Amino acid sequence: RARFVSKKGNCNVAHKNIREQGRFLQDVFTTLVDLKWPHTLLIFTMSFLCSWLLFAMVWWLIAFAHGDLAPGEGTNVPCVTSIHSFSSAFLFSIEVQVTIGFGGRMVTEECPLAILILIVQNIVGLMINAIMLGCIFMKTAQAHRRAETLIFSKHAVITPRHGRLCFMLRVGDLRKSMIISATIHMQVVRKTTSPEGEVVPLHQVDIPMENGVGGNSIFLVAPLIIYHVIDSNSPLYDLAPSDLHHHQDLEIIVILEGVVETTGITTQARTSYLADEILWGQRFVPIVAEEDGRYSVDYSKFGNTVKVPTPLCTARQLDED
Amino acid sequence: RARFVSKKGNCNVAHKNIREQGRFLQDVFTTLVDLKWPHTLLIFTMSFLCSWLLFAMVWWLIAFAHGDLAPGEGTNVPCVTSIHSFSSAFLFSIEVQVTIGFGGRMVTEECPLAILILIVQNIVGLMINAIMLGCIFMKTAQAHRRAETLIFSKHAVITPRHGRLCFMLRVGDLRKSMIISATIHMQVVRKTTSPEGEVVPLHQVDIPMENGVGGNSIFLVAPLIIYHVIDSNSPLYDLAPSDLHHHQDLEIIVILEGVVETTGITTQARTSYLADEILWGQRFVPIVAEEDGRYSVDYSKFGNTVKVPTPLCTARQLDED
Amino acid sequence: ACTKYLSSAGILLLSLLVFSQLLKHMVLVAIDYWLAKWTDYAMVFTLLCSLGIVLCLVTSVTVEWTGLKVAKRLHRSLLNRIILAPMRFFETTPLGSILNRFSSDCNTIDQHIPSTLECLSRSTLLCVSALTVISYVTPVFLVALLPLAVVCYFIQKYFRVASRDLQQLDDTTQLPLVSHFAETVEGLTTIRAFRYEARFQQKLLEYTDSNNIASLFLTAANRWLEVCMEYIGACVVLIAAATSISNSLSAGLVGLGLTYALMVSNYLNWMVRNLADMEIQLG
Amino acid sequence: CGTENHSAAYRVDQGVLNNGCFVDALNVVPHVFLLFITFPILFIGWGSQSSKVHIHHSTWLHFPGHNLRWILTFILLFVLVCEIAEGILSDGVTESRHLHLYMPAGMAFMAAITSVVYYHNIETSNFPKLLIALLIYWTLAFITKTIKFVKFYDHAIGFSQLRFCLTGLLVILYGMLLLVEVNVIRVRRYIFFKTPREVKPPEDLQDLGVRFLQPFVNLLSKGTYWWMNAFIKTAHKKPIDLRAIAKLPIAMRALTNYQRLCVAFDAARAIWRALCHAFGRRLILSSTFRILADLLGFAGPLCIFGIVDHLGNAYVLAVLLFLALLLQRTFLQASYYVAIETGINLRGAIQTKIYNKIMHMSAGQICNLVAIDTNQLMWFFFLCPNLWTMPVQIIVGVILLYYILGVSALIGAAVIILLAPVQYFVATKLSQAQRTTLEHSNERLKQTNEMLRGMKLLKLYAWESIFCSRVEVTRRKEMTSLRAFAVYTSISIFMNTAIPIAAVLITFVGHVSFFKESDLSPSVAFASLSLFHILVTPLFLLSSVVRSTVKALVSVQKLSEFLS
Numbered sequence A, B: 001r002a003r004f005v006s007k008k009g010n011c012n013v014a015h016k017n018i019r020e021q022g023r024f025l026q027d028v029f030t031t032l033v034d035l036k037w038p039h040t041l042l043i044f045t046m047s048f049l050c051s052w053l054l055f056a057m058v059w060w061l062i063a064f065a066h067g068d069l070a071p072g073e074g075t076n077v078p079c080v081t082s083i084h085s086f087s088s089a090f091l092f093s094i095e096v097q098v099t100i101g102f103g104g105r106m107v108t109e110e111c112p113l114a115i116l117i118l119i120v121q122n123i124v125g126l127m128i129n130a131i132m133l134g135c136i137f138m139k140t141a142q143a144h145r146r147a148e149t150l151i152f153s154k155h156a157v158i159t160p161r162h163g164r165l166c167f168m169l170r171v172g173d174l175r176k177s178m179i180i181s182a183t184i185h186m187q188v189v190r191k192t193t194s195p196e197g198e199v200v201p202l203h204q205v206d207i208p209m210e211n212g213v214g215g216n217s218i219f220l221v222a223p224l225i226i227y228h229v230i231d232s233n234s235p236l237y238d239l240a241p242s243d244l245h246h247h248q249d250l251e252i253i254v255i256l257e258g259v260v261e262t263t264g265i266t267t268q269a270r271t272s273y274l275a276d277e278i279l280w281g282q283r284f285v286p287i288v289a290e291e292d293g294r295y296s297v298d299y300s301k302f303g304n305t306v307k308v309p310t311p312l313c314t315a316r317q318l319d320e321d
Numbered sequence C: 001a002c003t004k005y006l007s008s009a010g011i012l013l014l015s016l017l018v019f020s021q022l023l024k025h026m027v028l029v030a031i032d033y034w035l036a037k038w039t040d041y042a043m044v045f046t047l048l049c050s051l052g053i054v055l056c057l058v059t060s061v062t063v064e065w066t067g068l069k070v071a072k073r074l075h076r077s078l079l080n081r082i083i084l085a086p087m088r089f090f091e092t093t094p095l096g097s098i099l100n101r102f103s104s105d106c107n108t109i110d111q112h113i114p115s116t117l118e119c120l121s122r123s124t125l126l127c128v129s130a131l132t133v134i135s136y137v138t139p140v141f142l143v144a145l146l147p148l149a150v151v152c153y154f155i156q157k158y159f160r161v162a163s164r165d166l167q168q169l170d171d172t173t174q175l176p177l178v179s180h181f182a183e184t185v186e187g188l189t190t191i192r193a194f195r196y197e198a199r200f201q202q203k204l205l206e207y208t209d210s211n212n213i214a215s216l217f218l219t220a221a222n223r224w225l226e227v228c229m230e231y232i233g234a235c236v237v238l239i240a241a242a243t244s245i246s247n248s249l250s251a252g253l254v255g256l257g258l259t260y261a262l263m264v265s266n267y268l269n270w271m272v273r274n275l276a277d278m279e280i281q282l283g
Numbered sequence D: 001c002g003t004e005n006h007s008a009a010y011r012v013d014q015g016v017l018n019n020g021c022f023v024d025a026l027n028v029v030p031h032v033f034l035l036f037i038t039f040p041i042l043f044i045g046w047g048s049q050s051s052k053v054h055i056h057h058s059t060w061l062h063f064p065g066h067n068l069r070w071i072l073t074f075i076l077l078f079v080l081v082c083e084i085a086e087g088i089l090s091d092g093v094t095e096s097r098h099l100h101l102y103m104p105a106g107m108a109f110m111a112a113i114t115s116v117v118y119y120h121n122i123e124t125s126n127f128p129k130l131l132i133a134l135l136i137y138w139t140l141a142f143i144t145k146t147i148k149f150v151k152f153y154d155h156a157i158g159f160s161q162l163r164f165c166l167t168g169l170l171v172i173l174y175g176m177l178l179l180v181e182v183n184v185i186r187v188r189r190y191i192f193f194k195t196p197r198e199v200k201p202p203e204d205l206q207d208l209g210v211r212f213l214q215p216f217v218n219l220l221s222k223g224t225y226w227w228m229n230a231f232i233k234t235a236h237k238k239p240i241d242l243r244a245i246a247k248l249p250i251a252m253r254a255l256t257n258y259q260r261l262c263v264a265f266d267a268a269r270a271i272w273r274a275l276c277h278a279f280g281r282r283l284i285l286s287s288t289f290r291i292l293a294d295l296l297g298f299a300g301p302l303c304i305f306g307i308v309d310h311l312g313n314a315y316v317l318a319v320l321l322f323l324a325l326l327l328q329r330t331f332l333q334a335s336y337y338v339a340i341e342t343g344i345n346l347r348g349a350i351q352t353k354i355y356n357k358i359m360h361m362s363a364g365q366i367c368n369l370v371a372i373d374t375n376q377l378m379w380f381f382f383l384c385p386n387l388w389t390m391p392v393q394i395i396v397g398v399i400l401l402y403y404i405l406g407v408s409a410l411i412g413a414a415v416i417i418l419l420a421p422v423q424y425f426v427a428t429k430l431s432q433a434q435r436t437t438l439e440h441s442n443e444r445l446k447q448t449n450e451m452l453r454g455m456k457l458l459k460l461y462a463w464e465s466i467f468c469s470r471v472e473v474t475r476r477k478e479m480t481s482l483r484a485f486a487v488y489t490s491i492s493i494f495m496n497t498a499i500p501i502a503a504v505l506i507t508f509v510g511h512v513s514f515f516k517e518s519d520l521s522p523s524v525a526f527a528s529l530s531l532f533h534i535l536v537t538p539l540f541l542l543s544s545v546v547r548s549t550v551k552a553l554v555s556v557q558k559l560s561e562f563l564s
Ligand SMILES: COc1ccc(Cl)cc1C(=O)NCCc1ccc(S(=O)(=O)NC(=O)NC2CCCCC2)cc1
Pocket: C215, C216, C218, C219, C222, C223, D336, D339, D340, D378, D382, D383, D386, D537, D538, D541
């Protein structure tokens, strides 16, 4: 009785024997963006800290090689001014990569090497900031947060409309902003067997949206009733009004794609309906009311369904008679 | 026996007599992003180095024109303080573009020209950083790395399903993250001749996905079996069960498009199947198993196919009888 | 409830046993204590010889006498209680459920329970003595001792669960092998002329493998618990040595502490293993 | 680095001037660089294991020649801890602190653990474009300690220059382990055109789900059973079923072990030789680990002796004792876990062989043969390592006991010589009473079966009392046998408790009363005591080993009979 995907999508599938070739880590940036915020912050905190520290040791050493640190004498000229301890060297490293340049610690012309190190450190730190920014930008574009604003009624009903038995489901959007080119796809997950004896554990069947023009798009502003009319080509043509719910173990996958009008990022709203989450002989209660100046949506009535007289047979039997 | 595209896509086609108009280089930024990381780094290392250096020479010269460098006398006032050698001038250049400003080297009001040079150098260096960042961002968006995470079975089989002879192929995704609006296109590359005597060296034929709603989209979470039912309109209607594999030299092109849920970047997964990579009379072994709490995918069984009794004739002959 | 064994034992021999065990263990502690007060001539050495005579067999003889008492009492009691019961309780229940108890449980009680309870109690009082002496030498050792005791508690619980499961599963696993084996001998010519022996090769392979993976896990489990129990013993060796030398900076207290710090690694293993075994065998 | 202004007076004096404190800062470099370059990489892996690790339980491979990598890391950590001790001893002048004379080493220790967890993560998921940093780090650290060692030889005093010897030791350590990964380069050759490397048998072994995946893990697990940890939490959570339990790995087959046994046969002088030729290679490793565990056990009271010597060089002995105990325990477990595996595979292959002999017959005795003697083999094999090991522990304990105590070592030697054949004798009379108890138990249980099956007919006649009196008769005969058991068990536990008392008592007293030139320091006494705590186990295990080898001769004799 395992679900393919949860009520909130979040597909629950294990993947055994991945022959990892290391491609998992090669894709460093999709991974970084995929990370939770606390880890993105730790990595960049660590990267900066390490970069500042790794270079700082080099600066301290160059001071040491020159031997300028303990003489503290005027005649000798240091490569990096005001360098008395590692700590002084560390602070110098910080001032270089984050471009502070306090000035109490300056680079002289004594060490042609110090000049080279300065060039390298600036560039390395520079590239790090470039990469870090790129990563942060993509994270701020994680539109999946908008996917959480999309609503799917907990249960979908089966009722006749225009004399035809159909599958109904309510969907909505809580934000004022729109989702452009909102497209809905519906698949039926069913362990199926062909006549050739072939067995499929999770066969996915495409379900038409009864769109008037055969399209999959929908202008969703107010909660809408998405439905599928069951016909000779629908896998639900043989649904039993009583056993389909509990003894059969099927799952309806509802996918809502589209782009956020604000970012341009394509997202997905995923949900599922097990056999026991579907109601037979019930329909949805109207949600939209009307004020003198506008239309109003009552979201507390989303899961509100009522029992209506309905034929208690399979769609096939209904058509046969 | 040359392949159009490799098993891993990477289309292998030479392009002779390009009448290059220079548009190849005009598109500097698509090119920069296209470059491998080591070269992107070298270019920007070089660009900074050059920019820092080119300007540094100018700074040294302005010191020279003023003649402030060798007098080292107090009465005279330098345009740029602490300038004794080119090296001192170089370090000054660095401190300006990467905005360090150590302070040991400052710009005075003596040279109205030095002031102008400072303005120019800041802006030039500023624009460079802007362009450099832009380039780095697009590189961090190179979602082709996700294309490498997509799997295509090495060989595709030909077996009957529901009594109809069909072409089967397994496809998967190794990452937890999804690919939105995943669309599959299938083309047949065949040197073909019309009745008018016209000859085409690489004619591409469109192949339907047997989608229940006539769509090309697929919600791929678990490995799926993509197939094409051979009919009167399919170019495989006359396939010979034995000679189609070796004496005929056809190629099946499989394209998997879609956008990465994390970046919003559209990518492609490209693969091909030569005649000898197709099996006749074999099907795929089930991959998905089931644990008490979830569904499990065994990826080590991807290329696992078994022999099943099948008609040994062309799809046409099968239909004729 | 393990106390039913105690009620079948009688309180008097319990008192004899526990008082004699505490007697000989505190005698061992006192031997090492006056050894320390020695080493930091006739007097305390004659005291040590007089101490070392005191340790005696009485706990062992008390254990064995008590086991004989429990055996004859439970045997007579279950015999008379079952022959009191009507024929209907024999008819509803399987006779194998009675006779398997009669054979296995009596052989368990009369062969393995008494000695293993004695060694479990002995190892228990030995680790108590070791911790007591190490705490007596190094008083601030207890701060380090506490979370290690917590970790030993957690490991202890997890091991006991996994060990009961694997042990019972191994004991059930080995039996259809010898069952199939005896069958395969009894119908040998039948299978040969049937020419089905490849099938029963395969079945014996399945049974044999099963007995292996069952045994392997049991062995692996035992090793895992044993390995962890020693790491903690090595840690308390380190901490006791550091604290003792830090405070010393007398000799005898430190040397006793290190001796018992050595012994505690074997003590933990012995106690846990015997605990899980007795938790099985009191069923 | 120092007290006065000398840290600079290095470079104030001209040229290189051999750079005394400076080479320590050069050795800082490799270690600090390593941590920093790899922190970003290691961290993403750590975050990925927190995010999505269901894929991580699917993929496993070993780089070629990696066991020696593990053990070289272990012993270099050992010597690093030793040079940390040398650095603290050198700073023990304490006129001022000398950070650069022990901290560099400490950073190496930190670096070493990272340098091996990084290797564990590249071995976790194959990405050979990632140990480039690793090998350049090893060659750079090798170069820096090489410079340190040659300047040490430039300022040499020679043999007792302790840091010199230790330094060159870990120099050639890094050099040889550096050669290890270029052997890995020679294998995989990823910088030139190819790497076709993949394991099927652990990967296809993984197909059934739950695993006894020990044969393929890191050597850390192979000492500590790290893999087991994950498995037990489930058993605490949910109950355990046979389906949940694993299926043995590719090499672990009754078929495969039987096949190698058949190869051994194809190759007194027959079956025994085949068994050795089939399992000797596997067995001798357990023996070796057991021998090393013996040496590390004898290191214990030596450390006690030195500690109570200096308390009459202290924490260093404790730390070395700590490492010795860890490796000892681990070595003992390794020997234990290999003895077992050999036993098991022997049981499966021998059962298969017996079965095929039955299949070639062109019966309760045969069931007894399998159900007894194969189990005896399994057990004997576990205690097979001890056949020559027991002589070592006892003898080397005697040698150190003499080097501590002088003439009184023969007292405790007399105690243990009086110990062992007493155990043998009591085991003999135990087995006699076992056979008596088996006879009485068979009588009682068979009569009990007849009574329980006819218990209805006894209920018809109220004839239960007569046959319960029969039960009582056979039960009293059983109680006679059980009193014999009580006798023999009490005498065994009295031996195993009272022997360590008498040994210590008579040894110290005969020492001191034998000559008034005795000197009963705690360093003598307690080291001898802990030796006596060691040497109970070998004797008490050796008596059972002797009886086991008698039973072993019997098992081979009966199998020789049946395989005829
Ligand atoms: C543990 O005493 C000793 C003391 C000292 C010496 Cl030098 C050797 C031993 C010793 O024992 N050497 C045999 C090696 C050994 C025996 C038992 C155990 S164990 O922890 O009881 N685990 C199991 O027996 N598993 C069973 C074994 C039989 C098949 C089915 C699984 C672990 C290892």
